[PDB]
Design a protein around this nucleic acid. Structure first.
Ligand code: MG
Ligand code: MG
Ligand code: MG
Ligand code: MG
Ligand code: MG
Ligand code: MG
Ligand code: MG
Ligand code: MG
Ligand code: MG
Ligand code: MG
Ligand code: MG
Ligand code: MG
Ligand code: MG
Ligand code: MG
Ligand code: MG
Ligand code: ZN
Lengths: 25, 64, 43, 95, 211, 125
RNA sequence: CCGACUUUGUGAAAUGA
RNA sequence: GGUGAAAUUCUUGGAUUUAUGAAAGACGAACAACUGCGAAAGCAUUUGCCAAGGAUGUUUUCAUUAAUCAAGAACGAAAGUUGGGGGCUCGAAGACGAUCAGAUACCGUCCUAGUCUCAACCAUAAACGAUGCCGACCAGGGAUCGGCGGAUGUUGCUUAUAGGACUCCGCCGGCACCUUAUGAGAAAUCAAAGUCUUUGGGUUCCGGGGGGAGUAUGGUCGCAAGGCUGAAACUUAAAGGAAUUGA
């Protein structure tokens, strides 16, 4: 499942970017 | 007190074993000549051999 | 019995025995367990 | 590359088939994709039929048969040689 | 260890062909663990084949209750019936349908119980259709018919005669000759009789069904 | 005189249980494992042989001569096929000198069972 | 919290003497 | 108990095993199919009520009222989120036992949320026939489901027929299936993926090398996970499909 777990990596890294943006808000 | 029973190898059913080492035969009891029980024997055996059989119950099953 | 201290804390086990004299039996009385109730124990 | 017309299962007219458990490993495979055999096996094999019919208490008794309906998945079927990989052409018949 | 156990004589009620179904055993009567009433409720599972010395009825395992004991001899009253497991599986095959029903009946002596009846459709000879299925409405009509017939058959004087009907398959052979207008229904039986709530003791009532 | 031979013959062991006609009292109870040293040979067919002959001897020590077999697999939501020891123990209990009453397979089959162990993709070993 | 004595009478069985 | 094998575990405070009874909560075996119903998701114990629906039958009615549809709207598996109910089995997390060089995994033991019901959300699945919907024609056959029509010949039925079960034939309407090119195509394959360079029946959606990327941002629905909409820089000469020989 390279494609699935790739998707999940990007999903995690994207919650992490939202976490950073609500810091810098 | 298990007393050894003799049986005659009526026909050799095959040569089984993982390595091809065990003959798998039918033994017909001399003592009561209606008991055909199927066993595994080691070493060269041909038809009609009288075979010394310590335990009677232990039998093979087709392609054991 | 929980009183005082330079910080706010109980300082001793908050579960007290069934026979503890009146005035000591404050807290969680004769508790069989504590913590959030999970699983069968929450029945 | 499509390998089978029916997909390996025979589901037509449906969208969902209630699943079952493999008897070996308990993999979940749908009821109509699972290799289903109905085996009916004597309690004993033919080296042990007279020695129990000369010990049945009451004369004229017949042995039961184990009626059971086993279910397997494709993995356990291939592994147990219940089914075999057939050639491209021979793969197509159903008998 | 097994020297303090004495055997007892299990014997079945008089509505059966043969009696003296077997021998059980209890620890001899002490006080508090008296043997007589200590067990009182052994449920035995005797096949109907060796209670009627027949072999067409090697199915139909009759299950008996011990209800009182009389001097090295334990009495017994009927408690239930069921197929032996092997029968019913041989009865169900692919390419047909299975039909089943169940109904509470209360008989004249206040005995509640449950009837589970079963049937299968026939292939009429000359059939080339590879299957014999009903149409799921004939199924419900015949299930209603089965329940109606069984209620009417039952609601009679006691388990005494009600087992005089169980033994020769009265319910069975009287189901189809009422409902074959809808399907043949081969191998109709009553797979099970489950006694729901036994009423009372009635020393006097036991002793005519059992002697 | 009859007994009931509750032969719980699963994999991993075989249990021979002899009880009276009412199931409330054990006449004798030998497992396949009581008679072998190995936790893997506790399920071989031979264990069923000697564990059955021991039951036969103890039953003739006590009075029963015939015996209603009740063969049984694990039952429940597991395999319904009696394990390796079933036929072997039946052969031993027949030929050791005893009479067998009525043979029957009483392994619990549910009308439909709870979730069976293993998870979705099963035991993948 | 617990045991014994006490208010505390009547009679029945099972194990111990 | 467990496995190829073990132990953690339970066990002379009697485990496993046997029978009887109770309680709880889940699941509805076998019958069960190249079978039915549904817009898809999905839907298997019984009976009842409630309302709906395709097909068939029709010498009933209305008479173009129709097809497909940006906006908009309903339903939408599992997982998930909030809060009551329940807490059987199974079980992400977690902890142990083994395996291993390690083993955060496969194997086994305990087990939380969860699994079930209700109230409220979410709006995605390999949501698959990877095949939008309506229509016409074109090839053959027997099966099978539903209805209907036509035939004697017997019922473990029937106050006798009828009916119902079975057999034969034929019409529709289903899900399919088998042989064949005279067809198509990159081919596997397809009787509909055919009637296309001799190219047009209608209609909607959508793709333009592979990545980056379903990512950044902006918007907007959502409590949250998320969903819907969605680039560019720069990178690259192949990525991919079908089949053939080999290894
Ligand atoms: Mg303080
Ligand atoms: Mg401190
Ligand atoms: Mg359909
Ligand atoms: Mg689906
Ligand atoms: Mg016990
Ligand atoms: Mg149907
Ligand atoms: Mg069912
Ligand atoms: Mg999508
Ligand atoms: Mg798609
Ligand atoms: Mg689609
Ligand atoms: Mg038809
Ligand atoms: Mg048709
Ligand atoms: Mg592109
Ligand atoms: Mg691809
Ligand atoms: Mg390729
Ligand atoms: Zn499997």
């Amino acid at each position: 499942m390279r494609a699935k777990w790739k998707k999940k990596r990007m999903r995690r890294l994207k919650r992490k970017r939202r976490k950073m943006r609500q810091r810098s808000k | 007190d298990t007393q050894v029973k003799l049986a005659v190898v009526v026909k050799v059913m095959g040569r089984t074993g993982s390595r091809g080492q065990v003959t798998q035969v039918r033994v017909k009891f001399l003592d009561d000549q209606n008991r055909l029980i199927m066993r595994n024997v080691k070493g060269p055996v041909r038809e009609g051999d009288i075979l010394t059989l310590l335990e009677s119950e232990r039998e093979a099953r087709r392609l054991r | 019995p929980h009183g005082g201290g330079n910080h706010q804390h109980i300082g001793h086990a908050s579960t007290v025995r069934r026979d503890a004299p009146p005035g000591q039996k404050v807290g969680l009385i004769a508790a069989r367990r504590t913590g959030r109730l999970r699983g069968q124990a929450a029945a | 590359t499509f390998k089978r017309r029916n997909g390996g299962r025979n589901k037509h007219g449906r969208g969902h088939v209630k699943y079952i458990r493999c008897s070996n490993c308990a993999k979940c495979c749908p009821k109509d994709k699972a290799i289903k055999r109905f085996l009916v096996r004597n309690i004993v094999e033919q080296a042990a039929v007279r020695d129990v019919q000369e010990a049945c208490v009451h004369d004229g008794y017949v042995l039961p048969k184990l009626y059971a309906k086993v279910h397997h998945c494709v993995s356990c079927a291939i592994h147990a040689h219940i089914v075999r990989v057939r050639s491209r052409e021979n793969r197509r018949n159903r008998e | 260890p097994f020297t303090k156990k004495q055997w007892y004589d299990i014997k079945a009620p008089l509505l059966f062909t043969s009696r003296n179904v077997g021998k059980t055993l209890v620890s001899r009567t002490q006080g508090t663990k008296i043997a007589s009433e200590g067990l009182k409720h052994r449920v035995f599972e005797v096949s109907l084949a060796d209670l009627q010395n027949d072999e067409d009825q090697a199915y139909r395992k009759i299950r008996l209750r011990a209800e009182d004991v009389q001097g090295m001899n334990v009495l017994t009253n009927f408690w239930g019936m069921d197929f032996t497991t092997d029968k019913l599986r041989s009865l169900v095959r692919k390419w047909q349908t299975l039909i089943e029903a169940h109904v509470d009946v209360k008989t004249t002596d206040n005995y509640m119980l449950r009837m589970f009846a079963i049937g299968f459709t026939k292939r009429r000879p000359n059939q080339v259709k590879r299957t014999c299925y009903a149409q799921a409405s004939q199924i419900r009509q015949i299930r209603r018919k089965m329940v109606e017939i069984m209620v009417n058959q039952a609601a009679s004087c006691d388990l005494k005669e009600l087992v005089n009907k169980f033994i020769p398959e009265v319910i069975g052979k009287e189901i189809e000759k009422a409902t074959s207008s809808i399907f043949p229904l081969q191998n109709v039986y009553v797979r099970k009789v489950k006694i729901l709530k036994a009423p009372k003791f009635d020393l006097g009532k036991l002793m005519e069904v059992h002697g | 005189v009859f007994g009931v031979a509750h032969i719980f013959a699963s994999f991993n062991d075989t249990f021979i249980h002899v009880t009276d006609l009412s199931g409330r009292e054990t006449l004798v109870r030998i497992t396949g494992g009581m008679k072998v040293k190995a936790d893997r040979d506790e399920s071989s067919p031979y264990a069923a042989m000697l564990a059955s002959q021991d039951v036969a001897t103890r039953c003739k020590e006590l009075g029963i001569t015939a015996l209603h077999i009740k063969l049984r697999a694990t039952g429940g939501n597991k395999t319904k096929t009696p394990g390796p020891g079933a036929q072997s123990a039946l052969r031993a209990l027949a030929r050791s000198g005893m009479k067998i009453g009525r043979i029957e397979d009483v392994t619990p089959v549910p009308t439909d069972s709870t979730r069976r162990k293993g998870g979705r993709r099963g035991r993948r070993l």
